[PDB]
Amino acid sequence: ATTLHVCTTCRGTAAAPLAEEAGPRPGELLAHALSALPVPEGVTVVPVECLSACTQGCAVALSGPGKWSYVYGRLDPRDADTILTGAAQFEAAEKGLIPWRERPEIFRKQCLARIPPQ
Template sequence: MTAKLFVCTTCRVGEPVVEGQPVPGRRLYTLLTSQSRSSGLEIIPVECLSACNNGCVIALSASGRWSYVYGRLTEQDAPDILAGAEAYAATPDGLVPWRQRPQIFRKQSLARLPPQEN
């Protein structure tokens, strides 16, 4: 089953919008999609995750699993984001053991949502 990594492409991280220049959220999405990853992880751009005061924001979700929202992320976090998303995708329930999570997933979680009933 495929896990979905949603990346807010409108996150500005407080930066002004410069015509013709991608905002930080779009740059993070572009960087994440340029990296190799397992076929069990789909990266999806979204217009807004409504966590605008929390820097670049991502969400992880899969059917029957816990979902997570993480914030205060940067392009430098891309390797850890992918490592954490890959670990999430490998679980049957979305619960990655605490010590196996990247530091940013331990410290920068904004929300955790229970699995939706099928």
Template sequence: MGEIPNQSPDDQSPEDQGPEPVVLTVCTTCRPEGSDPEAPRPGRILADRLAGSALPEGVTVRGVECLSACKRSCTLHLSGGPARWGYIYGDLDPDAHLDEILAGAAAYASTEDGFVPWRERPVVFRKQSIARIPPVSMPSVALTPTQAPGAQTEDTPDTPALQSAKD
């Protein structure tokens, strides 16, 4: 019998490499409306606390300057590669939600597709979801192209230009 050669990580198939790493991306710049602009931002506090926590295996945390969800201040994006669903959560409280976020990240990391059944999600992930983002690998729904009302097509003549007030 021949020996099985050692494989480098580059030689392994995606199934052999295990799941994609999970990333908790936290907005560090948003703040609740009416809060002191000089006070530490809740997202920065949350990101720092997550970074100092015992993160679940395969989970990392990173801070970014904007997730563009300012009205839902203290926001994070939970992602895990092109085959998993992604989630955006807002209205988070670094003092009240840290343990639930860690539990939710652990549950998410244990899935292949990022889908944790609703009843198994921490309450903060059930109640404060902003968006669920489909995996890149998910097939799209068949679309039937239609024109928006009032849209011009190549068959429609151009609308005459408005005449100037001088005419």
């Protein structure tokens, strides 16, 4: 059982005083993109108000009983399909530990933290 938490408040990493306007929050756009796609077996997408990774939006988290927990950031709504593929690999992997060379590039380069299984 894999849970993919997606922050719905996240703003992008652009400099707010310099960036052009707002619109819907990227985290909200990412959440919607994740919900439009087929959710893999074993994965459940759960929106959250904040993953305390605000400086690295968009942020999502992967966790499950007996597995490592992961937080990834600096994501974009267009990463939704790769995120769900990653979440599937997370569900299949032993303890959530995906072999490094098999992880999507965003999981290798944009991981913010991991936590040992409870």
